[PDB]
């Protein structure tokens, strides 16, 4: 009945959106309670950008130098801290638009709904995963650092991930909201790799269950293949080794669609071996990986919040 | 800097879905100001649905038979009239979160934000563009019916889409918020024909300028052509046809990229009569139709509401 990338309803954390200017540098900030928390370089120029002390420049700031708005609003700011690459400002005021949250760190291959934000304004929202290499592939202009990732429990808001930088590939990097950056990351502008990035077979296969369910059967066949054969084929594509692990989370939807894990492995196997030779699966010309399996039951089954 | 399917904030579209009940049918409504907006078909039994006489079986049904709840308050029906295929029922209570709002009919090739829901909850939010032959491509389970696209304009919603039903091909068709169905469609368990679709051209010149916006530039020839000879490829590749009126839509996106529309369509000519043959553009291995001029001006430049 349709495969979508969707995301979650944005409206909590639209909430929870400010803008924070420290001197002349302005983001976006998340206001919970009476903290406001945001990417520690905002007190930073362009030129401490290239090598910042971020102990020595902070000590230069008071209160009152960091201006953080709520739409119109002005929150006074009674204190300030530094927590690895966050800055917590606290302010007078606790946010009446305030969800039930919790601070997670996600893993890698696990997927969240981006806020892209603007002066503290939301501009869109979208989903993406968080890549084996712990950077994520987003859309994030000047300004926007301080959007936010997050999934959503009922309830529930789960702020797994604050933007911070651009690296050279042109895939992004930030940190938890402890301000502990995902991956071997620094927030200052140097030259910074990722590691070579890896396919999140899981993610694949669970797109595949998706398939199936939505009428795409055409890559299906009459192989099969073991934990151990496959993974000889995962390495060779550089794609994840697959677990038995990974095998129990899929098993609802095996269940679901009546087909064994290691039989979806090898109609994989035969797709990463031989192409797609000009068709497509799910509308996609390519093998999707950034659908978890609870992100597959979650859309198949019409999970709300 | 990135180039992502990016949809609008949903805060404002989420505090105006309520749950509308008639008999054993459940599906959504929009609730603005003193109205609450939704299919007919919520008054059908799932016999009525093969043939149903809309205006007998509405006599049938008064105020205290439709239970409209928003969240678990109850409000009150104190009216109801059909209007084309939107049901339209009038409450004591004027919703609190009504943004400020249009109804609007888009057209071919537009695009807007759907905010999935069920019962009367949001799920989850994704882009799609209305097809040349007036379908969507959209994620749509039971109960979805209801659920509404819409676009937003700095403070303003503009509702342009209500659901109503899934085709046989698997995409899905619906209303304006006057309840007049886009293309031939009518709100019946028939089988139903859409036309042969075709690409949105403009839309992928576009996206075209937003990969070499996004340094994405291989795809670029030394070639160019007339609007008529690309025409003529258009219509073997069942394109849609390039006017000067989506010249000049190009234009701003021709002036940043110092790129001549017609250069461009010389470059798509030669993707469409040669394939990817194995590369991707803005990581997909597809032509991608569903973003507009305006859609990548507004990602590439920031525009927040
Ligand atoms: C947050 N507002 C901003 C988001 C950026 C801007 C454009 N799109 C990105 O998401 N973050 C920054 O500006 C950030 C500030 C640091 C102090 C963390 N820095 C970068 O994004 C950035 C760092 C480093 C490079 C870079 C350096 C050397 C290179 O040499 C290899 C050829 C390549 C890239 C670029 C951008
Ligand atoms: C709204 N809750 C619901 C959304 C559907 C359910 C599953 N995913 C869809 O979006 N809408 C309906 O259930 C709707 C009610 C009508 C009274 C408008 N009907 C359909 O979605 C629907 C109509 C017709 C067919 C169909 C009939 C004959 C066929 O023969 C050709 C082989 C094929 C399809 C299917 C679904």
Redesign the pocket.
Same mark, same amino acid.
């Given at each position: 009945s349709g495969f979508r990338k969707m995301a979650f309803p944005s409206g909590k954390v639209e909430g929870c959106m400010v803008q924070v200017t420290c001197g002349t540098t302005t983001?976006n900030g998340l206001w919970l309670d009476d903290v406001v928390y945001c990417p520690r =370089?905002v007190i930073?120029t362009s030129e401490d950008?290239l090598n910042?002390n971020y102990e020595d420049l902070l000590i230069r700031k008071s209160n009152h130098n960091f201006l953080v708005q709520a739409g119109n609003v002005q929150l006074r700011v009674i204190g300030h801290s530094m927590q690895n690459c966050v800055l917590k400002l606290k302010v007078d005021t606790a946010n009446p638009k305030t969800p039930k949250y919790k601070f997670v760190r996600i893993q890698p291959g696990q997927t969240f709904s981006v806020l892209a934000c603007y002066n503290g304004s939301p501009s869109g929202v979208y989903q993406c995963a968080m890549r084996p290499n712990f950077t994520i592939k987003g859309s994030?202009?000047?300004?926007?650092?301080g959007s936010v990732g997050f999934n959503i429990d009922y309830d529930c808001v789960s702020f797994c991930y604050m933007? =911070?930088?651009?690296?050279?590939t042109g895939v992004?990097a930030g940190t938890d909201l402890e301000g502990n950056f995902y991956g071997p990351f620094v927030?200052?502008?140097?030259?910074?790799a990722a590691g070579t990035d890896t396919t999140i077979t899981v993610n694949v296969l669970a797109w595949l269950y998706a398939a199936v369910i939505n009428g795409d059967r055409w890559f299906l066949n009459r192989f099969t293949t073991t934990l151990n054969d496959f993974n000889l084929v995962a390495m060779k594509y550089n794609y994840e080794p697959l677990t038995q692990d990974h095998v129990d989370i899929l098993g609802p939807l095996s269940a679901q669609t009546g087909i064994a894990v290691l039989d979806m492995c090898a109609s994989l196997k035969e797709l990463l071996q031989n192409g797609m030779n000009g068709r497509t699966i799910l509308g996609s010309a390519l093998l999707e990986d950034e659908f978890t399996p609870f992100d597959v039951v979650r859309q198949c089954s019409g999970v709300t919040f």
């Open positions: 983001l =370089h930073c950008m910042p994030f202009l000047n300004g926007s650092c933007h =911070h930088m651009e690296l050279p992004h927030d200052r502008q140097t030259a910074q």
